Design a protein around this ligand. Sequence first.
Ligand SMILES: [Zn+2]
Lengths: 141, 116
Amino acid sequence: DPNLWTVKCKIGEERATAISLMRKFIAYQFTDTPLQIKSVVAPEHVKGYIYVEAYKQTHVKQAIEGVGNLRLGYWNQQMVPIKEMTDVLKVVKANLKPKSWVRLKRGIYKDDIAQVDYVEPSQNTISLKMIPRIDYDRIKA
Amino acid sequence: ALETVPKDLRHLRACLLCSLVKTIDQFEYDGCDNCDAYLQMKGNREMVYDCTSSSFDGIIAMMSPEDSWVSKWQRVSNFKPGVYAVSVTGRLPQGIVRELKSRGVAYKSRDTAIKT
Ligand SMILES: [Zn+2]
């Protein structure tokens, strides 16, 4: 079975790296220097490095040449045991369902629990249920 | 191919049968490639929102399903290369899942993630 290798990357750039690798593979698949990589895993929970699937280290080492994003993680290629080939894909509970409970960061109701009522298909705004905390304009000037 | 690769990161959805992740423009124009005759997705947006759901996490660069343990584990070996996911949360209504079994399409839950 193929092996899974690990490569460091910048913090906050994982989907961009994935799409760039996809574009590079698609553009250099019909040439004399194809890429032998099988796939790459970029879990959402992790942030700072990405995974890659290959047999040998030389494959990925020569497949990540020229890219300016993975330059940092180019002089070292760590190998993980075979037991870690299934925990990476695990996800602990996406996270968008009506009639659920969610919390807020901005606004005034910071660090408070609230409840979803309706979701707009436009993916621009979502309703929310919360009890008001204002003073009803009796204290403030 | 260049038609399955997502164009813009923003406004991206994913299917529930084969977990095909692409852009909304590609879904509206091209639609689901791995399952089109049995889904009838091209030529409309209501069906896109009815079946596909944006509640999904994880991205994998599938390129050789015939030879890949990830493909075997996810049961996506018989699909075309593309950008798939590992967990899509959702379930089709009780109006579209019925005909898949009648037409010989086994509806399986791709939400491999655990709950609590
Ligand atoms: Zn699908």
